[PDB]
Design a protein around this ligand. Structure first.
Ligand SMILES: [Zn+2]
Length: 379
């Protein structure tokens, strides 16, 4: 409402940045962001209606993949991007480390917390997979790795609340040996194992968290001395995901697939951080390609993906899940794709690790180290 407009008797997603960019103002902005975020939640229904339609949710959480990496690797034209129904162009991962990224995603149903708030119990309604479990979705955890490095699996269980056994990995082919020497299993093989298990279950409702490590630095083909080229690994991954999307189409199963990277791999370095270093969660590291694709709809989306250009993060994924949770979009004769993709929650691109916060303020990036004075991020 403008200065001379009025509100009605009885009457923002991102706090305003009109004040000059001093340390005090940027600190105040961040505190205002934290206050606004803490009040945000995607509300799930109390129970599903009796005419709800079962479907499977599959969340594909990929280490070390940002838009900057896709650009540096020359993979912007890979067919996979064209295959989504919904594609985010300014999705912020909120961090540049794997454990906090996975916890943030598992806590997608409430607004964005500070890094310290991630390692403390949260409200039960923040846990996307718990919200689904309550509604009758069977919970599954799978990975293409053993999760031992960095205590990743322990973080996912303890802070992400994902108290589910790791899906069986016996017999899977190894695609890479990881930077810690342990296997990275082939992703198509993991996904096909999942598809056979789900198809064993009928009109079950299930929600699966799948974490993928092939793009992590230091991974190599078995027996090969050099780290496998990132472009080669990313092409392999994207070819396998696209092959799987084809398998899912053939299955006729109702499936909502969400692809959400954890953070980038810092393929292209910058002034502050040489290639591969990502201790500061810069915009280049945290702007990640997130996408959603629905399978088995009566009325599937046609043509190119719907771009979501507004600043977004995990809360927008949770909102899409609530919009789908009764399964009815899968059986509608005609879907209002505009309405389904409109009025999604917007979230300012704030990112943190324990030691650093990065924000955009009046369109420029700043970093705060250990609660000190803000300085421009040198880009
Ligand atoms: Zn990672």
């Amino acid at each position: 409402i403008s200065e001379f407009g009025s509100s009605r008797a009885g009457d923002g997603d991102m706090p305003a940045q009109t004040a000059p960019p001093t340390t005090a103002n940027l600190n105040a902005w961040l505190n205002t962001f934290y206050a606004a975020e803490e009040k945000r939640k995607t509300t799930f229904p109390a129970q599903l209606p009796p005419d709800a339609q079962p479907f499977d949710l599959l969340v594909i959480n990929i280490c070390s993949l940002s838009w900057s990496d896709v650009e540096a690797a020359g993979l912007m034209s890979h067919p996979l991007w064209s295959h989504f129904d919904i594609l985010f162009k300014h999705f912020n991962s909120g961090t540049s480390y794997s454990g906090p990224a996975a916890i943030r995603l598992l806590r997608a149903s409430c607004g964005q917390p500070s890094h310290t708030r991630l390692y403390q119990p949260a409200n039960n309604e923040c846990y996307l997979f718990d919200n689904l479990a309550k509604l009758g979705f069977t919970q599954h955890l799978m990975m293409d790795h053993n999760g031992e490095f960095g205590g990743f699996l322990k973080e996912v269980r303890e802070n992400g609340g994902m108290q589910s056994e790791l899906m069986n990995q016996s017999g899977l082919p190894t695609a890479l040996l990881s930077f810690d020497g342990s296997p990275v299993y082939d992703d198509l093989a993991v996904l096909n194992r999942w598809l056979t298990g789900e198809e064993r279950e009928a009109n079950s409702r299930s929600a699966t968290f799948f974490n993928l490590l092939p793009l992590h630095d230091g991974n190599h083909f078995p027996g090969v001395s050099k780290t496998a080229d990132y472009k080669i690994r990313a092409q392999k991954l994207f070819d396998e995901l696209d092959a799987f999307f084809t398998e899912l189409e053939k299955s006729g199963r109702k499936v909502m697939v969400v692809v959400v990277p954890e953070h980038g791999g810092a393929l292209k370095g910058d002034r502050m951080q040489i290639s591969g270093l990502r201790d500061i969660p810069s915009p280049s590291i945290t702007n990640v390609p997130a996408g959603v694709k629905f399978f088995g709809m009566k009325a599937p989306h046609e043509g190119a993906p719907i771009d979501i250009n507004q600043p977004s993060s995990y809360l927008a994924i949770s909102e899409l899940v609530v919009r789908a949770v009764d399964g009815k979009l899968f059986t509608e004769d005609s879907v209002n794709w505009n309405k389904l993709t409109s009025n999604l929650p917007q979230t300012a691109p704030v990112s943190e690790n324990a030691n650093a916060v990065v924000i955009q303020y009046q369109g420029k990036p700043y970093v705060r180290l250990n609660g000190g004075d803000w300085v421009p991020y040198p880009q």
